[PDB]
Amino acid sequence: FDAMNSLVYSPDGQRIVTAADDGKIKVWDVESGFCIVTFTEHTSGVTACEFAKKGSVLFTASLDGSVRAWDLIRYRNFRTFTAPERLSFTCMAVDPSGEVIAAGSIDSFDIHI
């Protein structure tokens, strides 16, 4: 019910996951068109979401200041990252190994890792 800010396919290609400014992200299945899980831990609008090469982990940044990191075989955010001074991340990328997250905001011009 808000603007869909970003989306990524899964590396298998069976399901896509989109992140909107409603605060929720959800994983739609391409066949059958239904959302299969709605992650609702962000308390503000969700910007860019990304996968790794492995396709089991999803990293999502948002304006509430946290780059969260979900595991899609157990459906729980095993990590949440914040900057020490409080930022509001608007874009992010992740190494294809899945071990380094970089994220950048509009409030400070440094780029966090």
Binding site: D21, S44, G45, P84
Partner: protein, 67 residues
């Protein structure tokens, strides 16, 4: 100067700025993020928490999510 250094080192008082936690405000207890009348005053504090949730949502939405 050398004896001043020896006195400070022995009865060790150093004027270095110490590394403080970056979330001392919101997390003052420093909990670990893994596996884990006066009722009038408590009701007043919860009312202020509710008011601030509504007002912070309104102010962030009025500044259009630059905050």
């Amino acid at each position: 100067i050398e004896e001043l250094i020896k006195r400070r080192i022995l009865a060790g008082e150093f004027d270095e700025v110490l590394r403080r936690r970056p979330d001392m405000f919101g997390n003052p207890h420093g909990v670990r993020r893994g596996l884990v009348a006066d009722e009038k005053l408590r009701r007043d504090e919860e009312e202020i928490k509710r008011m601030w949730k509504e007002i912070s949502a309104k102010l962030d939405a009025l500044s259009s999510w630059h905050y």
